[PDB]
């Protein structure tokens, strides 16, 4: 089923691209998942977790990354940012999916990632952010996924 209502479009509001920006959250949130710790999560498991590659207040604190997801969420919750509620929006930003997750995954269903030399200042930044996200979900379990992402799926 198609993803844009033909010529009955309100406006071209898809700056977030459903088939061009993300496939499995730029398709390299499962390649880094296979790279760090091999767990499949392909046939039925859920990628509708972290569309903060699709938010320009959290994608900026993901370029400066540590090496664990809990450290990133702790870097959300200090006095440098005066924040911490937006980690709890993993709970909120998947109900109606304003970030168009679970819609920008139909187009997805192992060739190399496109190299960092072809920068374009946004696409490779989101590729790095989503590889960080994909390698950070391989170190956690489902109870950990409900624990540190603060969700009740």
């Amino acid at each position: 089923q198609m993803l844009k209502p033909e010529n009955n479009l309100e406006k071209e509001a898809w700056e977030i691209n459903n088939p061009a920006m993300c496939s499995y959250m730029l398709w390299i949130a499962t390649l880094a998942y296979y790279q760090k710790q091999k767990e499949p999560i392909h046939p039925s498991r859920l990628f509708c977790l972290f569309p903060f590659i699709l938010y320009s207040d959290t994608r900026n604190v993901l370029l400066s990354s540590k090496g664990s997801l809990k450290s990133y969420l702790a870097k959300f919750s200090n006095s440098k940012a005066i924040s911490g509620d937006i980690p709890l929006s993993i709970h909120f930003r998947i109900d109606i999916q304003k970030n168009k997750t679970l819609d920008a995954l139909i187009v997805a269903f192992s060739i190399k990632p496109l190299p960092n030399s072809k920068l374009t200042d946004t696409i490779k930044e989101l590729v790095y952010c989503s590889t960080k996200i994909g390698r950070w979900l391989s170190e956690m379990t489902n109870q950990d996924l409900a624990r540190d992402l603060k969700v009740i799926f």
Binding site: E10, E12, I16, P51, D57, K98
Partner: protein, 274 residues
């Protein structure tokens, strides 16, 4: 004949009063003159029984400003070459039109000087003012189809049906692209949901549909297109209060959204079939 070449001497001028103009040359300073005052620019034939070569352009009174076209070569190609060279820029392929509305000006003043037999003093300052107005108009319409075309859009063709002004066409072209830029920038940050636009512009039938029927039952003496005149000016005042885009948005929004309807098939300010 003279109208195709009278603008040529006016281009090399700076309030110099290039006069277009036997049965003449007894006028000794009939009107107020200027320092240059390019005189006696009227020949159409070669030598005849009256000797026109008495001074042979030596360059009435002591020092003569006589200058005439040799060979009667009316409407040349070097008239157009005097605009690409010498002064001014432009040259965006609408230059035959600029020439067509600048030969009309000298044709109109020559028709005014055909009757009412006083001298035919032509202001170079007024020629420069008319040429500047033509240049401003054509620069203004070459600003358009760049900020509008991504020929003519479907929200500007229908805005020319009522055709209130050109500044409203400006505000439509500015507001539509600025609204698109703000929606792109909101989608860059994820500030406004994708489904929020259906909750904001499909509910503008509380303006287009209840104020489309408000003044139609109020005003009935409007024959064809003036019944859609004040509907636009009431929509532009009754739509900048809407809190359906979560928080209320700025005044630049919901004007270019109304212009964003008319790019596709919709109901609009036109009271006709389109």
């Amino acid at each position: 004949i003279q109208e195709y070449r009278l603008t040529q001497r006016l281009l090399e001028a700076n309030n110099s009063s290039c006069i277009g103009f036997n049965w003449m040359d007894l006028i000794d300073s009939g009107e107020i003159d200027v320092d240059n005052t390019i005189f006696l620019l009227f020949t159409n034939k070669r030598c005849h029984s009256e000797v026109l070569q008495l001074l042979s352009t030596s360059q009435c009174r002591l020092i003569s400003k006589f200058t005439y076209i040799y060979g009667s070569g009316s409407a040349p190609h070097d008239l157009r070459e005097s605009y690409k060279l010498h002064r001014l820029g432009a040259l965006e392929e609408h230059l035959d039109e600029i020439m067509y509305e600048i030969l009309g000006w000298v044709s109109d003043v020559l028709t005014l000087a055909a009757e009412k037999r006083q001298p035919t003093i032509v202001r170079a300052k007024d020629f420069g003012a008319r040429l500047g107005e033509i240049e401003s108009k054509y620069r203004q319409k070459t600003i358009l189809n760049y900020f509008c075309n991504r020929d003519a859009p479907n929200y500007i063709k229908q805005l020319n049906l009522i055709n209130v002004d050109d500044s409203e066409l400006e505000e439509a072209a500015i507001a539509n692209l600025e609204t698109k830029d703000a929606v792109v920038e909101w989608t860059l940050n994820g500030d406004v949901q994708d489904y929020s636009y259906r909750y904001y512009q499909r509910e503008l039938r509380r303006c287009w549909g209840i104020q489309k029927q408000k003044i139609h039952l109020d005003f009935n003496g409007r024959p064809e297109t003036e019944v859609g005149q004040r509907l636009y000016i009431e929509c532009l005042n009754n739509v900048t209060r809407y809190y359906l885009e979560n928080k209320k948005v700025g005044d630049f929004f919901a004007h270019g959204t109304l212009h964003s309807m008319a790019d596709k098939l919709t109901i609009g300010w036109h009271p006709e079939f389109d």
